[PDB]
Amino acid sequence: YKDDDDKLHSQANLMRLKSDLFNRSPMYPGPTKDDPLTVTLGFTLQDIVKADSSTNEVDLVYYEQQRWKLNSLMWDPNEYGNITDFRTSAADIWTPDITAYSSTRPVQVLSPQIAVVTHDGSVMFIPAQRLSFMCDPTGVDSEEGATCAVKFGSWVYSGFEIDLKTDTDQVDLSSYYASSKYEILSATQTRQVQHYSCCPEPYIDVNLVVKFRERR
Amino acid sequence: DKLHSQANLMRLKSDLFNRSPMYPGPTKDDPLTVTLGFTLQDIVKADSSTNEVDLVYYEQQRWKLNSLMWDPNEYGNITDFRTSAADIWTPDITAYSSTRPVQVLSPQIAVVTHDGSVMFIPAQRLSFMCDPTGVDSEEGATCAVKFGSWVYSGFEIDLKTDTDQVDLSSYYASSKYEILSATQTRQVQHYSCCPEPYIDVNLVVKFRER
Amino acid sequence: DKLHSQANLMRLKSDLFNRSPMYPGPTKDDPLTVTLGFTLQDIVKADSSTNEVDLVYYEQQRWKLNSLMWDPNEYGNITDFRTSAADIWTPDITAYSSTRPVQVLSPQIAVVTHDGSVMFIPAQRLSFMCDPTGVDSEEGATCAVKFGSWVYSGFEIDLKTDTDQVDLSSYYASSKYEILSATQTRQVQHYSCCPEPYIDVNLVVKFRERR
Amino acid sequence: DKLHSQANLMRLKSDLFNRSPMYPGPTKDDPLTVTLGFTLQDIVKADSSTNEVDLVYYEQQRWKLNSLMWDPNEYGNITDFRTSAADIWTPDITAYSSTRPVQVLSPQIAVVTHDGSVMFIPAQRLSFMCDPTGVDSEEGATCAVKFGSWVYSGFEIDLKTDTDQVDLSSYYASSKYEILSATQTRQVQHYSCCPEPYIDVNLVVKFRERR
Amino acid sequence: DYKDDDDKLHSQANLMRLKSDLFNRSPMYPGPTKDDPLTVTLGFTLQDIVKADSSTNEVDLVYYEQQRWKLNSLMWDPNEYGNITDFRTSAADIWTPDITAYSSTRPVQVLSPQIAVVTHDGSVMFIPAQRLSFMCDPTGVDSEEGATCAVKFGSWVYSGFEIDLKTDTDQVDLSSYYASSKYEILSATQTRQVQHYSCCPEPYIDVNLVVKFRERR
Ligand SMILES: C=C1CCCC2=NC[C@H](C)[C@@H](C)C[C@@]23CCC(C(=O)O)=C[C@@H]3[C@@H]2O[C@]3(C[C@H]4CCC[C@@]5(CC[C@@]6(O[C@@H](CC[C@@]6(C)O)C1)O5)O4)C[C@@H](C)[C@@H](O)[C@H]2O3
Ligand SMILES: C=C1CCCC2=NC[C@H](C)[C@@H](C)C[C@@]23CCC(C(=O)O)=C[C@@H]3[C@@H]2O[C@]3(C[C@H]4CCC[C@@]5(CC[C@@]6(O[C@@H](CC[C@@]6(C)O)C1)O5)O4)C[C@@H](C)[C@@H](O)[C@H]2O3
Ligand SMILES: C=C1CCCC2=NC[C@H](C)[C@@H](C)C[C@@]23CCC(C(=O)O)=C[C@@H]3[C@@H]2O[C@]3(C[C@H]4CCC[C@@]5(CC[C@@]6(O[C@@H](CC[C@@]6(C)O)C1)O5)O4)C[C@@H](C)[C@@H](O)[C@H]2O3
Ligand SMILES: C=C1CCCC2=NC[C@H](C)[C@@H](C)C[C@@]23CCC(C(=O)O)=C[C@@H]3[C@@H]2O[C@]3(C[C@H]4CCC[C@@]5(CC[C@@]6(O[C@@H](CC[C@@]6(C)O)C1)O5)O4)C[C@@H](C)[C@@H](O)[C@H]2O3
Ligand SMILES: C=C1CCCC2=NC[C@H](C)[C@@H](C)C[C@@]23CCC(C(=O)O)=C[C@@H]3[C@@H]2O[C@]3(C[C@H]4CCC[C@@]5(CC[C@@]6(O[C@@H](CC[C@@]6(C)O)C1)O5)O4)C[C@@H](C)[C@@H](O)[C@H]2O3
Ligand SMILES: [Ca+2]
Ligand SMILES: [Ca+2]
Ligand SMILES: [Cl-]
């Protein structure tokens, strides 16, 4: 019965932490110019599924890793039975509105929408996705291959509210499907800055550039 | 000071969304101006077996409400915020000759500024009625589709444009189809049945195989 | 004025939707007339490998409730308003021979007038059962699909039309298919089991491949 | 008096839905009979590259609950009403060998009668596992799909039919496929693990390409 | 105290009281933790290989995915509730494990009612029927040796110190396999694998579904 109570007790601690973080205190309304947020973005490309030259659409399957850190999600694990992290439904917390800028169909989510929250206040959210986007696969049947590119970024926040960044410019290809119809020649993920004439604030995206060819 | 910034935004939003009778939509005594514009990104597909064409575009919608106005001084110099499109009233702007339900490609979030203006820009994929005959020639094909309120007249939603030129500066350079022109013309009509004006925006695209 | 216009509208909605009972649907003692009409916009596709045809149309539905009545004088001269179709009772009018769920193309919003009348006009894409044999001939193909209430007899929902001619004034001029005729005929059926009449509107379209 | 018929119905629905315990599902001590019947409307598609066939049918389901009975004399002679299927318990009848989620074609509304019986007739399009080999010959193709509760044994839901003949009186006369026969046969099975009987209805359809 | 007062009540009455006590009253289960890990047993019953697309290297499978776990917070004494030993609940009204195909190419399509069976020992049985498109090269399907493909299933967000994924057998149940499928199964195995990463001390668990198949002659 001791072990049963320890288990009951760890649950009570997890619920106390969640109740402290989500119900007792005000939650996150989203970033502002006086409280900007850094979102780190990374791609793990799994498969090029289809390259359609009649419409110039290509379909990719990838994991999109999103990470940010909030003071409001920080806690001392000592105040909560040494809990260092927990899980939560992505709908229960603020998440950044990162979107592909040149999709041709709504993105299809392939993983459960659950985020990992760590005691330093960092949130990790890794939606697995199938995306159709604009791409001319001319060259795919040659040694040089085809090249396509799609930009990801916030829909409604500038770089003074959400600063987007990558930890590396190299797309993780260590999970790329070895028997895909297409082989990857290179895949890069590059933070780009753009300014509009109207406006002094920078606008940021991460450009996913994939060079690929028919596997032979 | 980051604490106070967040506190000010939370206060602004509860003041506007919880402590105030929120906008129930327009009336004939209280008409709303809605300004509409298109940024055409791609002609994805032109199907000659069914005469349907598929477009991807950003549809910019703007309107302004007194109920969404505030003084940035009372709220730590906050001049704008974001809200879910589901949490505010949005206009019922619809394509009149779509052949499939529109597919939304962007997060359904609007930008509200302190002057009460709301900007909502859904990226959409639309299939609509279009005969692509001529697309494989130099002159190209021409198609058209009207957008407007489904249930409000021009005395209720005053639908306007800022320009008759569709923005082509985001158009995909390697589309199967090149754009010869794209216009967005406001049409104000009076039908014999009724005294109210009815307004639509007629999107006309002339295009050909690249 | 504009703060009073909005105040009265919100007050009218409150009085209809929160301070009297909402409509539980028709009964044999309190039957409801529903008037139905079609505006055919396009025959998108005719599939001879499965005998399905796809139409796009606007389906106009009209009914009238004493519980949606008001005196405009008591509400600042407001003579109509709009409501989500989810927030009111609507009639269960269904195609009887569809092959895929109907796809709705228009915002699901209804128009309520002070006389209690409701107007609801969904734009729809429908796939239904149809053999398009003859479509590539001068005589063309002919198909038909019935619409009616799924669960109410004619003693509970009295289905009517205003005309037996489908409105073809919005028909897409450059469709793959040219319309030869489109009619919408009220039909009354009687089953031997049952004294009550069963009503449908039979949409019959004759069409052929354009020239 | 039409305000009184409306009020009587609201009073009936309040008494049944809000002022007594709603039905939580069957139990071993109190099992429920569910009667199932098919009305086959169309074979839309037979796909010999994946061995899937698509059917449109009406699936009639009927059960009876003490908790839904009333005396019509206590409620202005109301003998039946309609309810959204979402607002009452419904049985978990499932095709066991579908290959795509079922697609519902009719409004999800049930008919409740004063004896407590509930009638629910969803129209559905179903893709299921079927080898159409022979469909282009005179003897035709034969396929079968079982239906039953996903989670209740025969000691909890006693599944029955009224007839082993599938109703073909609404079958589309201009389908690509004609029906040679269609039967719905109650089957009882036991598993080594367990004493309870498990019940299904085997829908067996023989069909061929129409001439 | 005796446990006789419940015997006088309708079985439905007792069922509603049981659900009420477990769901409405008990603060429910926040999911597993390192201090309170959960065992989840996973098993597959393969019903059909519907489609093998050599133009995209996607294969479509239909199968029943059996999931079983046991929670203390869902235990009860049948003697307090008219000898009710089990009940059904919407899968949306309880916690369920986040078991995910790792190499799907389309969202899974659910083919059965999302209802779970809860037994008085606290065990939950949940068996969604599913259609899955996943990454698979079917080259060789038109030969005697056939094609081989694999797809791993596991928790998306929990390590092996939080959800221990188990199997009852490494044999995929083929006793419901569609006898007239376009494809015949040569073999089908489900192997629990433990993965260790350079970065991290926690083990990670998946079940690898490996199917060898060919076109039925
Ligand atoms: C909802 C929106 C923008 C949605 C469309 C886009 N969103 C991501 C960011 C903010 C844009 C810079 C890019 C854009 C998506 C991708 C894109 C392209 O690839 O060409 C163009 C998008 C851009 O977005 C607007 C107005 C945007 C440009 C930057 C300055 C500004 C002015 C205020 C501001 O308004 C926007 C949000 C941020 C804010 C408040 O600073 C309003 O941005 O307008 C409008 C589009 C129709 C398109 O023409 C292009 O211009
Ligand atoms: C829900 C509706 C109309 C939905 C269909 C359309 N909506 C947008 C506006 C209001 C119409 C002028 C156009 C219409 C869509 C496009 C269209 C076409 O391209 O041909 C025809 C649409 C029109 O809409 C009605 C009645 C509409 C015409 C204008 C006057 C009026 C009378 C009252 C009013 O009712 C309508 C709303 C506005 C209101 C209250 O002022 C009822 O409009 O009826 C009904 C359709 C079936 C179609 O025949 C055509 O006629
Ligand atoms: C939910 C339902 C019926 C759903 C299916 C249909 N609904 C619309 C009306 C009520 C039917 C006459 C037609 C029917 C749809 C179209 C159709 C066909 O094209 O063949 C057949 C539908 C019919 O509907 C039933 C029982 C219906 C026939 C008329 C008398 C009656 C008996 C009571 C009653 O029950 C029905 C509702 C009305 C009610 C209460 O008066 C039960 O209707 O049963 C059941 C079907 C399986 C089919 O065989 C055919 O018979
Ligand atoms: C959710 C479920 C079963 C879902 C799958 C099926 N459901 C309908 C009924 C109950 C089964 C007899 C058939 C089955 C669907 C069709 C099918 C087939 O055609 O092969 C096999 C289904 C069966 O269902 C299990 C365990 C089922 C068989 C009978 C006894 C029992 C033991 C307890 C019990 O658990 C089940 C519910 C009923 C209950 C509580 O009495 C657990 O059923 O387990 C599990 C499947 C993987 C499959 O192998 C086959 O065996
Ligand atoms: C949401 C996630 C991971 C989602 C992706 C995957 N989830 C299931 C488990 C946890 C992974 C080991 C596998 C992985 C799916 C399958 C897969 C593959 O087949 O290659 C790779 C997935 C993996 O998951 C990450 C970070 C994962 C590796 C193990 C250690 C760690 C660090 C903390 C932790 O973070 C993850 C949850 C568990 C936790 C908190 O312990 C964060 O796991 O990161 C992230 C992916 C982009 C991919 O590169 C690969 O690496
Ligand atoms: Ca007209
Ligand atoms: Ca007892
Ligand atoms: Cl008109």
Coordinates of N, CA and C in Angstrom, one line a residue, chain E residues 40-156:
Chain E
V40 N 1.3 -0.5 -21.4 CA 0.3 -0.6 -22.5 C 0.7 -1.7 -23.4
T41 N -0.2 -2.7 -23.5 CA 0.0 -3.8 -24.4 C -0.7 -3.6 -25.7
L42 N 0.1 -3.8 -26.8 CA -0.3 -3.5 -28.1 C -0.3 -4.8 -29.0
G43 N -1.3 -5.0 -29.8 CA -1.4 -6.1 -30.7 C -2.1 -5.8 -32.0
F44 N -1.7 -6.4 -33.1 CA -2.4 -6.2 -34.4 C -3.0 -7.4 -34.9
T45 N -4.2 -7.2 -35.5 CA -5.0 -8.2 -36.2 C -5.1 -7.6 -37.6
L46 N -4.4 -8.1 -38.6 CA -4.3 -7.6 -39.9 C -5.5 -8.1 -40.7
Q47 N -6.3 -7.2 -41.2 CA -7.5 -7.6 -41.9 C -7.4 -7.6 -43.5
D48 N -6.6 -6.6 -44.0 CA -6.4 -6.5 -45.4 C -5.3 -5.6 -45.8
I49 N -4.5 -5.9 -46.8 CA -3.7 -5.0 -47.6 C -4.6 -4.6 -48.8
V50 N -5.0 -3.3 -48.7 CA -6.0 -2.9 -49.7 C -5.4 -2.5 -51.0
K51 N -4.3 -1.7 -50.9 CA -3.7 -1.0 -52.0 C -2.1 -1.0 -51.8
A52 N -1.4 -1.3 -52.9 CA 0.1 -1.1 -52.9 C 0.4 -0.2 -54.1
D53 N 0.8 1.0 -53.8 CA 1.1 2.0 -54.9 C 2.5 2.1 -55.2
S54 N 3.0 1.6 -56.3 CA 4.4 1.7 -56.7 C 4.8 3.0 -57.3
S55 N 3.8 3.9 -57.6 CA 4.1 5.2 -58.1 C 4.5 6.2 -57.0
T56 N 4.0 6.0 -55.7 CA 4.4 6.8 -54.6 C 5.1 6.0 -53.4
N57 N 5.2 4.7 -53.5 CA 5.7 3.8 -52.5 C 4.9 4.0 -51.2
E58 N 3.6 3.9 -51.3 CA 2.7 3.9 -50.2 C 1.9 2.6 -50.3
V59 N 1.7 2.0 -49.1 CA 0.8 0.8 -49.0 C -0.3 1.1 -48.0
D60 N -1.5 0.6 -48.2 CA -2.7 0.9 -47.4 C -3.1 -0.4 -46.7
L61 N -3.1 -0.4 -45.4 CA -3.5 -1.6 -44.6 C -4.8 -1.3 -43.8
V62 N -5.6 -2.3 -43.6 CA -6.7 -2.3 -42.7 C -6.4 -3.3 -41.6
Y63 N -6.6 -2.9 -40.3 CA -6.2 -3.8 -39.2 C -7.0 -3.3 -38.0
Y64 N -7.1 -4.2 -37.0 CA -7.6 -3.8 -35.7 C -6.4 -3.7 -34.8
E65 N -6.3 -2.6 -34.1 CA -5.2 -2.3 -33.2 C -5.7 -2.4 -31.7
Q66 N -5.3 -3.5 -31.1 CA -5.8 -3.8 -29.7 C -4.8 -3.1 -28.7
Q67 N -5.4 -2.3 -27.8 CA -4.6 -1.6 -26.8 C -5.2 -1.9 -25.5
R68 N -4.4 -2.2 -24.5 CA -4.9 -2.6 -23.2 C -4.0 -1.9 -22.1
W69 N -4.6 -1.3 -21.1 CA -3.8 -0.8 -19.9 C -4.7 -0.9 -18.7
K70 N -4.2 -0.5 -17.5 CA -4.9 -0.8 -16.3 C -4.6 0.4 -15.4
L71 N -5.7 1.1 -14.8 CA -5.5 2.2 -13.9 C -6.2 1.9 -12.6
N72 N -5.5 2.3 -11.5 CA -6.1 2.1 -10.2 C -7.3 3.0 -10.0
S73 N -7.3 4.2 -10.6 CA -8.4 5.1 -10.6 C -9.7 4.6 -11.3
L74 N -9.6 3.5 -12.0 CA -10.8 3.0 -12.7 C -11.2 1.7 -12.1
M75 N -10.7 1.3 -10.9 CA -11.1 0.1 -10.2 C -12.3 0.3 -9.4
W76 N -13.1 -0.7 -9.2 CA -14.3 -0.7 -8.3 C -14.6 -2.1 -7.8
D77 N -15.4 -2.1 -6.7 CA -15.9 -3.4 -6.2 C -17.3 -3.6 -6.8
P78 N -17.5 -4.7 -7.6 CA -18.8 -4.9 -8.2 C -19.9 -5.1 -7.1
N79 N -19.5 -5.5 -5.9 CA -20.5 -5.7 -4.8 C -21.1 -4.4 -4.3
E80 N -20.5 -3.2 -4.6 CA -21.1 -1.9 -4.3 C -22.0 -1.4 -5.4
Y81 N -22.0 -2.1 -6.5 CA -22.7 -1.6 -7.7 C -23.5 -2.7 -8.4
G82 N -24.3 -3.5 -7.6 CA -25.1 -4.5 -8.2 C -24.4 -5.6 -9.0
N83 N -23.2 -5.9 -8.7 CA -22.4 -6.9 -9.4 C -22.0 -6.6 -10.8
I84 N -22.1 -5.3 -11.2 CA -21.6 -4.8 -12.5 C -20.0 -5.0 -12.5
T85 N -19.5 -5.8 -13.4 CA -18.1 -6.1 -13.6 C -17.4 -5.4 -14.7
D86 N -18.2 -4.7 -15.5 CA -17.7 -4.0 -16.7 C -18.6 -2.9 -17.2
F87 N -18.1 -2.0 -18.0 CA -19.0 -1.0 -18.7 C -18.3 -0.5 -19.9
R88 N -19.0 0.3 -20.7 CA -18.5 0.9 -21.9 C -18.5 2.4 -21.8
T89 N -17.5 3.1 -22.4 CA -17.3 4.5 -22.3 C -16.8 5.0 -23.6
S90 N -17.1 6.2 -24.0 CA -16.5 6.9 -25.1 C -15.0 7.0 -24.9
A91 N -14.2 6.7 -25.9 CA -12.7 6.8 -25.7 C -12.3 8.3 -25.4
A92 N -13.2 9.2 -25.9 CA -13.0 10.6 -25.6 C -13.2 11.0 -24.1
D93 N -13.9 10.2 -23.4 CA -14.2 10.4 -21.9 C -13.1 9.9 -21.0
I94 N -12.1 9.2 -21.5 CA -11.0 8.7 -20.7 C -9.7 9.1 -21.3
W95 N -8.6 9.0 -20.6 CA -7.3 9.1 -21.1 C -7.0 7.9 -22.0
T96 N -6.4 8.1 -23.1 CA -5.9 7.0 -24.0 C -4.5 7.2 -24.4
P97 N -3.7 6.2 -24.6 CA -2.3 6.3 -25.0 C -2.1 6.9 -26.4
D98 N -1.0 7.7 -26.5 CA -0.8 8.4 -27.8 C 0.0 7.5 -28.7
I99 N -0.4 6.3 -28.9 CA 0.3 5.4 -29.8 C 0.1 5.8 -31.2
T100 N 1.2 5.9 -32.0 CA 1.2 6.5 -33.3 C 2.1 5.7 -34.2
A101 N 1.6 5.6 -35.5 CA 2.5 5.1 -36.5 C 3.5 6.1 -36.8
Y102 N 4.8 5.7 -36.9 CA 5.9 6.7 -37.0 C 6.1 7.0 -38.5
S103 N 5.6 6.2 -39.5 CA 5.9 6.5 -40.9 C 4.6 6.4 -41.7
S104 N 3.5 6.8 -41.2 CA 2.3 7.0 -41.9 C 2.5 8.2 -42.9
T105 N 1.7 8.2 -44.0 CA 1.8 9.3 -45.0 C 0.5 10.1 -45.1
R106 N -0.6 9.6 -44.4 CA -1.9 10.3 -44.4 C -2.4 10.1 -43.0
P107 N -3.3 10.9 -42.5 CA -3.9 10.6 -41.2 C -4.7 9.3 -41.2
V108 N -4.5 8.6 -40.1 CA -5.2 7.3 -40.0 C -6.7 7.5 -40.0
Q109 N -7.5 6.6 -40.7 CA -8.9 6.7 -40.7 C -9.5 5.6 -39.8
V110 N -10.3 6.0 -38.9 CA -10.9 5.1 -37.9 C -12.2 4.6 -38.5
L111 N -12.4 3.2 -38.4 CA -13.4 2.5 -39.0 C -14.5 1.9 -38.0
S112 N -14.2 2.0 -36.8 CA -15.1 1.5 -35.7 C -15.5 2.6 -34.7
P113 N -16.6 2.4 -34.0 CA -17.0 3.3 -32.9 C -15.9 3.4 -31.9
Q114 N -15.6 4.6 -31.5 CA -14.6 4.9 -30.5 C -15.1 4.8 -29.0
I115 N -15.2 3.5 -28.7 CA -15.7 3.1 -27.4 C -14.7 2.1 -26.8
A116 N -14.5 2.2 -25.5 CA -13.6 1.4 -24.7 C -14.3 0.5 -23.7
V117 N -13.8 -0.6 -23.4 CA -14.3 -1.5 -22.4 C -13.5 -1.3 -21.1
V118 N -14.2 -1.0 -20.0 CA -13.6 -0.9 -18.7 C -14.1 -2.0 -17.8
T119 N -13.1 -2.7 -17.2 CA -13.5 -3.8 -16.3 C -13.1 -3.4 -14.9
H120 N -13.7 -4.1 -13.9 CA -13.7 -3.7 -12.5 C -12.3 -3.7 -11.8
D121 N -11.4 -4.5 -12.4 CA -9.9 -4.5 -12.0 C -9.2 -3.2 -12.4
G122 N -9.9 -2.4 -13.2 CA -9.3 -1.1 -13.7 C -8.7 -1.2 -15.1
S123 N -8.8 -2.3 -15.7 CA -8.3 -2.5 -17.1 C -9.2 -1.9 -18.1
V124 N -8.6 -1.3 -19.1 CA -9.3 -0.7 -20.2 C -8.8 -1.5 -21.5
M125 N -9.8 -1.9 -22.3 CA -9.5 -2.5 -23.6 C -10.1 -1.5 -24.7
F126 N -9.2 -1.1 -25.7 CA -9.7 -0.2 -26.7 C -9.1 -0.8 -28.0
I127 N -10.0 -1.0 -29.0 CA -9.6 -1.7 -30.2 C -10.2 -1.0 -31.4
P128 N -9.5 0.1 -31.8 CA -9.9 0.8 -33.0 C -9.5 0.0 -34.3
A129 N -10.5 -0.1 -35.2 CA -10.2 -0.6 -36.5 C -9.8 0.6 -37.3
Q130 N -8.7 0.5 -38.1 CA -8.1 1.6 -38.8 C -7.7 1.3 -40.2
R131 N -7.7 2.3 -41.0 CA -7.0 2.3 -42.3 C -5.8 3.2 -42.3
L132 N -4.6 2.6 -42.6 CA -3.4 3.3 -42.5 C -2.7 3.3 -43.9
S133 N -2.3 4.5 -44.4 CA -1.3 4.6 -45.5 C 0.1 4.8 -44.9
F134 N 1.0 4.0 -45.3 CA 2.4 4.2 -44.8 C 3.5 3.9 -45.9
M135 N 4.7 4.3 -45.5 CA 5.8 4.3 -46.5 C 6.2 2.9 -46.7
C136 N 6.1 2.4 -48.0 CA 6.4 1.0 -48.3 C 6.7 0.9 -49.8
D137 N 7.8 0.3 -50.2 CA 8.2 0.0 -51.5 C 7.7 -1.4 -51.8
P138 N 6.7 -1.5 -52.7 CA 6.1 -2.9 -53.0 C 6.9 -3.6 -54.1
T139 N 8.0 -3.2 -54.5 CA 8.8 -3.9 -55.5 C 9.0 -5.4 -55.1
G140 N 8.7 -6.3 -56.0 CA 8.8 -7.7 -55.6 C 7.4 -8.3 -55.3
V141 N 6.4 -7.5 -55.2 CA 5.0 -8.0 -54.8 C 4.5 -8.9 -55.9
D142 N 4.9 -8.7 -57.2 CA 4.6 -9.6 -58.3 C 5.6 -10.7 -58.5
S143 N 6.2 -11.2 -57.5 CA 7.1 -12.3 -57.6 C 6.8 -13.3 -56.4
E144 N 7.4 -14.5 -56.5 CA 7.1 -15.5 -55.5 C 7.6 -15.1 -54.1
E145 N 8.8 -14.4 -54.1 CA 9.4 -14.0 -52.9 C 8.6 -12.8 -52.2
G146 N 7.9 -12.1 -53.0 CA 7.0 -11.0 -52.5 C 7.8 -9.7 -52.1
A147 N 7.1 -8.8 -51.4 CA 7.6 -7.5 -51.0 C 7.6 -7.6 -49.4
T148 N 8.5 -6.8 -48.8 CA 8.6 -6.6 -47.4 C 8.5 -5.2 -47.0
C149 N 7.7 -4.9 -46.0 CA 7.6 -3.5 -45.5 C 7.5 -3.5 -44.0
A150 N 7.8 -2.4 -43.4 CA 7.7 -2.3 -41.9 C 7.3 -0.9 -41.6
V151 N 6.6 -0.9 -40.4 CA 6.1 0.4 -39.8 C 6.2 0.2 -38.3
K152 N 6.8 1.2 -37.7 CA 6.9 1.2 -36.2 C 5.7 2.0 -35.6
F153 N 5.3 1.5 -34.5 CA 4.2 2.2 -33.7 C 4.8 2.4 -32.3
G154 N 4.4 3.5 -31.7 CA 4.8 3.8 -30.3 C 4.3 5.1 -29.9
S155 N 4.5 5.4 -28.6 CA 4.1 6.7 -28.0 C 4.9 7.8 -28.7
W156 N 4.2 8.9 -29.0 CA 4.8 10.1 -29.5 C 5.7 10.8 -28.5

